[PDB]
Design a protein around this ligand. Structure first.
Ligand SMILES: OC[C@H]1O[C@@H](O[C@H]2O[C@H](CO)[C@@H](O)[C@H](O)[C@H]2O)[C@H](O)[C@@H](O)[C@@H]1O
Ligand code: CA
Ligand code: CA
Ligand code: CA
Length: 170
């Protein structure tokens, strides 16, 4: 994949999440009621090939998009986060999502989802005003591929003066 360099911004739109009502084991999230999803997201510009968790970016650094109780199996989300690349070159950017079912103080993993942005077909657009959203991407769960988070992304060059520093923080 081609090296994308310059100063640019990536927007990640989390459209919806289909838990199918199940934990990563295939069991239902809960026995007598629906999943209680906490859904978190991160644009990983630094460690796209590394494992979920501390090897790439600690879960505490993700952005919380949903924190809800007894939701339908298909959770409509439409929240968006963004992150900038400031003079470094990248070949792959990993859109990362983690969904868990809350069980009081304990987490019940639904899945981790990772989708890569690469620049061969669709490199960053000239600027924000002309940048087009990707089609919805059906991003499969790492543990249960039939669980999908639907994602879209945009990316576009921005003036260097407007580029925001960031870190995976481990
Ligand atoms: O038509 C009004 C209705 O449309 C919803 O969204 C529909 O398409 C989105 C993709 O953006 C899917 O995620 C939904 O499953 C589908 O219903 C709007 O988002 C919703 O707010 C409106 O009620
Ligand atoms: Ca549970
Ligand atoms: Ca529940
Ligand atoms: Ca629960």
């Amino acid at each position: 994949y081609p090296l994308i360099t310059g100063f640019f911004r990536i927007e990640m739109n989390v459209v919806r999440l289909d838990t199918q009502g199940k934990s990563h084991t295939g069991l239902p999230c809960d026995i007598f009621d629906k999943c209680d999803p906490k859904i978190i997201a991160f644009i990983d510009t630094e460690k796209p090939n590394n494992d979920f968790g501390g090897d790439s970016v600690p879960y505490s650094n993700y952005i919380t998009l949903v924190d809800a109780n007894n939701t339908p199996d298909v959770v409509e989300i439409d929240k968006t986060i963004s992150r900038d690349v400031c003079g470094k070159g990248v070949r792959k950017i990993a859109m990362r999502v983690r969904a868990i079912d809350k069980d009081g103080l304990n987490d019940d993993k639904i899945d981790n989802y990772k989708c890569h942005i690469t620049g061969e077909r669709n490199p960053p657009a000239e600027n924000e005003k002309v940048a087009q959203w990707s089609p919805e991407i059906a991003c499969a769960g790492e543990d249960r591929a039939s669980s999908k988070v639907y994602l879209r992304y945009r990316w576009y060059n921005i003036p260097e003066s407007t580029c925001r520093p960031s870190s995976n923080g481990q």
